Amino acid sequence: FDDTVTVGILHSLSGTMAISESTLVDTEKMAIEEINAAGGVEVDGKKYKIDYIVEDGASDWPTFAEKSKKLIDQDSVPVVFGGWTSASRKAMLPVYESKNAFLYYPIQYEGQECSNNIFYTGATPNQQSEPATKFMFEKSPAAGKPFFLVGSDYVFPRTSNTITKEQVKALGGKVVGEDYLPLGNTEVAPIIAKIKKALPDGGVIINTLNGDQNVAFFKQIQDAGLTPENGYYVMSYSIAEEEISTIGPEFLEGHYGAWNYMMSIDTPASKKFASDFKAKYGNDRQVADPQESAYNMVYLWKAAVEKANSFDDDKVREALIGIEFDAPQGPVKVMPNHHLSQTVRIGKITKDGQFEILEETDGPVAPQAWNQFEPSSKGYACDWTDANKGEKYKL
Ligand SMILES: [Ca+2]
Ligand SMILES: [Ca+2]
Ligand SMILES: [Ca+2]
Ligand SMILES: [Ca+2]
């Protein structure tokens, strides 16, 4: 190596979100180690080793904003890989925008955003909850049954459920419940009683709980008899193979997810991701969509740097649009709206905590940041390649 570049990593390693975010740091570090082993990042004929600073967001959104300022100003990083909850991202967004910096954010979310200073590898709703909703209503064993929505009390679950309510109405179904718990809250018995009352003949439960309150939720719904055997099916948007392995797959068997990457994808690229992750971190370790999303961020950033011949975040962000990567999920591409074109999978959870893949799109789906079911965003798009279009413009 001729020089070094130091990037920022900002995730919850402690608190209620650690169950989800800790493995993202592991995965981002694996990508960095791979890139370094292959020669680093090439800029102006010089090979740069990638170093990193990890900051603990501690499941606390003001801390995410504070550590973002530290990484940008004190540490002079050219990108921060970070975030999970939309609460943490909304807290960080003014920091990256006011400092004209660059956050790369990997987690599935609600859309309704298109920051010039954020790029996104997590699913937008049309890459996750919209196909999942149609699947539950039309194809699942609870086809035609009513929907009950349960999530954490912040902007992702509330916005996701607003979209779901619009879509279920358009599909001709019914929503019979919508309830939120504060993030981390484990007092799930009252909502369980409501689900039993509202779905006396079984049905679909849409779960947007984030973090480790999912542990209490899945264990208590099983003890209450809200089980696939009794006609109750949960579709979850914010947990996958990692959290399932901590919870215990016996509590998730038979329930559903919708994701762009699943560990069970039967391709050399998917198997190599899993095998490499186990070799570095242990044979017990899972890979999953959040990790695949974060992995991709590092490789996409590296490609954009080499295309731009610069680490400057304005030049890298300009170069990043259009970049393609042969990812563990299949081919992905960074779009003019800064999001990622991705293949969509529907899965049913097995006794071992893997997904049985039941549906898969014919190639990747372009991300709709501005949601096309929600009346306020219908007809809008985002395109940062055209000065006359931009963050939010009418088609
Ligand atoms: Ca920890
Ligand atoms: Ca993704
Ligand atoms: Ca199959
Ligand atoms: Ca858009």
Numbering used by the authors: 37 to 431
Original paper wording:
Prochlorococcus marinus MIT 9313, a typical Cyanobacteria, contains an ABC-type transporter, UrtABCDE, which may account for the transport of urea. UrtABCDE consists of three parts: a substrate-binding protein (UrtA) located in the periplasm, two hydrophobic transmembrane domains (UrtB and UrtC), and two hydrophilic nucleotide-binding domains (UrtD and UrtE). UrtA possesses the typical structural characteristics of cluster B-Ⅱ extracellular substrate-binding proteins. It consists of two domains, an N-terminal domain (NTD) and a C-terminal domain (CTD), linked by a hinge region.
The crystal of UrtA/urea complex belongs to the P21 space group and was solved to 1.60 Å. The structure of UrtA/urea complex shows that each asymmetric unit contains one UrtA molecule. The electron density map of the UrtA/urea complex structure shows that a single urea molecule is tightly bound to the hinge region between the two domains, interacting mainly with the residues in the hinge. Compared to the other three types of UTs, UrtA exhibits a strong urea binding affinity, with a Kd of 141.3 ± 11.2 nM. The six hydrogen bonds formed between urea and Ser122, Gln144, Tyr190, and Asn246 constituted a stable binding plane. Mutation on any of these four amino acid residues resulted in a significant decrease or complete loss of the urea binding affinity. The effect of Trp120 on urea binding may be attributed to the formation of hydrogen bond between the side chain of Trp120 and Asn246, which stabilizes the position of Asn246, a key residue involved in urea binding. In the UrtA/urea structure, the binding pocket was present in a closed state, and no entrance was found. Thus, we proposed that apo UrtA without binding urea contains a urea entrance and will undergo a similar closing process as other cluster B-Ⅱ proteins. Consistent with other cluster B-Ⅱ proteins, the conformational change of UrtA without urea is like a “Venus Flytrap”. These results suggested that UrtA undergoes a similar process to the typical cluster B-Ⅱ proteins, in which a urea molecule enters the binding site through the entrance aside the hinge region and causes apo UrtA to close around the urea molecule.
